[PDB]
Amino acid sequence: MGVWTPEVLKARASVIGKPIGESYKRILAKLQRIHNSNILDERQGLMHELMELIDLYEESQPSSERLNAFRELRTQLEKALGLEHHHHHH
């Protein structure tokens, strides 16, 4: 949980839908897989690459220090790596 950032956020920031076709969209798409595969033993491996991948994509186009805005996303991935069980439910 706490790992949500689908096109919804981009739609709000971008107001009108307008997804770019390319790899840069791959990172955004990974959200769909992560969503369902949230904190999933399988996603655990991807989680690591996700954080590293972003670090390479953050400077790729948005090197204007704008990565700070995306840094919020990395936090979710970083926290996810905590594998902490905050669910606690009967």
From Swiss-Prot:
Q: Where in the cell is it found?
A: Cytoplasm; Secreted; Host membrane
Q: What is the additional note?
A: Closely spaced cysteine and histidine residues may provide the toxin with an affinity for metal. The sequence shown is that of strain NCTC 12178.
This chain's function reads: This is a dermonecrotic toxin. This osteolytic toxin, induces bone resorption. Potent mitogen. This toxin is associated with the severe progressive form of the atrophic rhinitis, a major respiratory disease in pigs.
Question: What protein name applies here?
Answer: Dermonecrotic toxin
- State the encoding gene: toxA
Q: Which residues of the full protein are shown?
A: 589 to 668 of 1285
